[PDB]
Symmetry: D2
Subunit: 313 residues, 4 copies
Amino acid sequence: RTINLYSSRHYNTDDALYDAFGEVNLIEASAEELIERIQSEGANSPGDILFTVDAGMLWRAEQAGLFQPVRSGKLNERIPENLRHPDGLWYGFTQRARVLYYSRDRVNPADLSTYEALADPQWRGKILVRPSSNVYNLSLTASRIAIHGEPETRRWLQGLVGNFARQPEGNDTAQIRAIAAGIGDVAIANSYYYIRLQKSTDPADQEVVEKVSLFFPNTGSGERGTHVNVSGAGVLKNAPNRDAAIAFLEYLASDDAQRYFAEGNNEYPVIPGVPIDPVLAAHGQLKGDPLNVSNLGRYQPDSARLMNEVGWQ
Amino acid sequence: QSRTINLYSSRHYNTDDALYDAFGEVNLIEASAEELIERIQSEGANSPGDILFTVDAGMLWRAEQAGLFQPVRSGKLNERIPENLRHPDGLWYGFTQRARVLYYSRDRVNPADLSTYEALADPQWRGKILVRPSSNVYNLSLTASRIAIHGEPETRRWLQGLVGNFARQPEGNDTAQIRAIAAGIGDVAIANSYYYIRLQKSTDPADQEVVEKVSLFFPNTGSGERGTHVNVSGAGVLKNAPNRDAAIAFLEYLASDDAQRYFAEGNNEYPVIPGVPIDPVLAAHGQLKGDPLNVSNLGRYQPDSARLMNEVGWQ
Amino acid sequence: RTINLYSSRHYNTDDALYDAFGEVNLIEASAEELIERIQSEGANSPGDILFTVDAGMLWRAEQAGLFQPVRSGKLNERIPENLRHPDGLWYGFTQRARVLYYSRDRVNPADLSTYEALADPQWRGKILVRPSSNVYNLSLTASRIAIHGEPETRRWLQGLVGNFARQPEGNDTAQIRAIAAGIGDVAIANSYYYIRLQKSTDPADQEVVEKVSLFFPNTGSGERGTHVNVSGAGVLKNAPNRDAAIAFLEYLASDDAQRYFAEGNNEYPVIPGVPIDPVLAAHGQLKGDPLNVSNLGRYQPDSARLMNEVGWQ
Amino acid sequence: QSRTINLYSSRHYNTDDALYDAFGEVNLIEASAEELIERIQSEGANSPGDILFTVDAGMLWRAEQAGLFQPVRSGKLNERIPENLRHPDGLWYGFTQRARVLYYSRDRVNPADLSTYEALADPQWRGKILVRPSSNVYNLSLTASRIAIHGEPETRRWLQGLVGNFARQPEGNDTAQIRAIAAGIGDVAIANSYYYIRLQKSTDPADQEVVEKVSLFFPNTGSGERGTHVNVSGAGVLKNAPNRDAAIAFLEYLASDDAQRYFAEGNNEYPVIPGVPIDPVLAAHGQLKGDPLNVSNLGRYQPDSARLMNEVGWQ
């Protein structure tokens, strides 16, 4: 089995995982760069699979026409419907949650509930989130548009931005560290960043863990579930090894591969029953929003528009 | 035993460990610039950090604004480091420099039509300009430099024209803009110099295709223009540095010819010291003619830059 | 689950494999260095597990008194008896084969059979093997002493050395490349080195693969099987986390972990039925000698003595 | 475009890539020394290798014996590289040097009792000496140097006494011998200088314990003794080098002060060029006083060394 895999994700157990499959010739760059490279390659791309992170980036690839639909009984049986494209263009293989982090000292978790509630006036001066250009934020806002519509999402964004502790700066972990530094009290950031800190041998990172806690939002009655997003992949339009490409996707969905692929970046498998990293699992069961993740891409342009309209820098 | 310091750096190239070992025992703490600033803030008045090294005068300024640096007075640093590549009050010092240049489609753009950042606001560039999001510090610093030079009203008008000429709403990183030219998405990108050097050095045929399709153009070097926009990576001694003398000694060492040469090589950047050999691939693009603006201006007008870029709709 | 793992083996999927278990604090050095470090640590070693490569090195650790015996129903059920110490002091977790490589152009594989036959006069000037100080060679010779006794092993060594293409020099892959360079015709080296070459993207390494083939010796009637050896581990005498240490050993013997742990260095799992790396598997079924691998250590001193007696440098 | 060469090297420290980039396009092929020699042999008369760089004069000699090198005549190399650290016929050149020194138990050995390699054959060292197996090229080269200096009969007698004093049959690598002293297995080890520097620099408390328990002693520096045994890592231009002029230029570059400093740092070795700063941790052990023996002697008597070591039972 041989394939040319273009991937914006690589951690290093991946190589034993890929070897077990066959020859996987890896091409690596950032997601936007790989999409553009494939675009440049016209009808002659040697790529079989594009693997990237965030349904918002899969949508950018999809928009550029990069994928061919595939029909695999195995992928359909195993991968939850809401974690794959309705037309079979791409499939999620890991998921992450965009959670809340809070100051243990300064925030009672009983006062937390939903993303939507962070627009409430009590959070004035307290909210930490990275810039609006980031695809994780584009996708969270996109999910809110899918759920609530544009007017309601605008009102939420207006409150949320109003409550910023500072103009967005830094990456997701920068928001977590900002709580510990006393700059703000509640941050929105992905789950796996906190697991990194917990696993760190750096005593400074343990200080952050001691001071800041993880809270899963939106798990109460009528709240839908925590926002989830995926890393995943689809078969490229002109894939020279189409059978092998589909076989690779099926392999990535296998119990063995799922377990250690998800471990790579402290993410959750997409396959139920596959063991979850113990440090991640100790935070509790993931109760994800059932929204089809294709909606994260669908409302990406509207999300950028609304976030910029209300002054989220 | 060796000189010792605690170096907090957002820059590391595998290639730097021998540079540091030659100095002494450099205990390296690494994280993104914003994270390091926040870590030091958390550590408070007894932080053991000796030096913060980071990339972009805009990041040094964020550190400065958090009150992280103490001023140092060093004859060697003053004599060697160009005055405009260090803070006027001795709070921090540039050790490498990069240029924010233009990239253009060889097939679709005639470089005679290029000149300055300012001219990219001309209506002929409608639907042609590629640049990454306004959140990025390299952009914040380029705009900050235009404010320093032209004032806010002029700079606002330039931003309006520039944004009006975007080929698409900003997405992806600097190299993504260069690749977007190759892919036919736009025709002129703004990105740093060293990203193109990476592509030239790459063994990947697809990277060589990009360098075949796109060329590097140094803007603002014409008669009566100031010079290309330059920015630095650099460092200062932290306010309550436990190893203050060693920290100053370390800054002096980083300014030495031996260290400058290979420190700059690490990321295909230019040394700040004149006469220190420049990477041959970078040097083949010609002599850097940098704007003499003191790089502290890049941080000084950072808030203004973020405000104006957002006002005009640079996403 | 937390343990202090001293290991002379590390490949980088190991980290996702270890994370799935718990916190595995890794200490790494060469095998002899780790044994000596533990010796220095007296009754105060923080180590829970010593993992090392070659039953000959496990024996050196065992000789230094470093292990405590453990009794695990799971290890006993799953790990073949011949791949673990009879007294439960240590357990193999991967295996390798010490095979023959031959010049495709110059050697007909029909002329190959056993290690023992390489002492035959037809191999004069043709045999390539690394120096006698190497533990892989110590263990192969040790197995011959276990099987044939010392007098017969001496006669074999005398013929074998007589047939050397050159005085031993270089590592195992150096012997493989030496065939391709025309220096000799048959080399003795481990299986996984050739798999490395096959997986290499370097066109020079593919030239070696095109010129040199792998042959499993000793698989005919009455030949016992190919010489095998293991990488494995035991619980340290003063292990501070004994329950966790045993749990880690059991985890290393699990189907999931076995698959990708063996992939790390292109080795075979010790557990039957666990998928084997496809490039390795394409060479055929491994038919290993059933000799208990504790014998490889047991006769190590005699092996060094005999090899040096007959002039194997 | 850049100068280009195909460098086959058995040495690489992450730390070298910036050193090579400063030169030009250095296409690096890496493998163990013996493997590289065999690869080049396989490639035959039209091998594209420009330079073979390897570690130990004994490995350069194996390359020489395979007829892999052409002689080069370079004024800069001749003027800069000490005559005794390069081949008399210009076939290859040392670029770093290491010393094969003694290590001793601080608690159990008084360094006044140490002097020369030769004295370790004295019966007082019975059951005390630690050294790695005779197959190892560092040992082959040390013994080869004694043959060059003393002749075979004297050297044989020295080997007999040395082997008779082994604390255990040789096992493990160089650092294993240093650790074996700490573990109480023996009291005096023979190993290279840079292995101890690694331990000193290590953040692992167990490594610091070894350096607390074991000290480095430079042998053969006494009155009327020749100097400590030194050996080199080094390179020559390959016989049918496609880029011959660039290859020579590359050797000249590796001998420059800038490159020497950090090339030596990579593995805690000494530069071959006098005046080039030495790593501070290494330098704190004192000035290297090397034996002036031409290092080509280390390869010249390699077969003799292997024969005599095996004859006397050094396993």
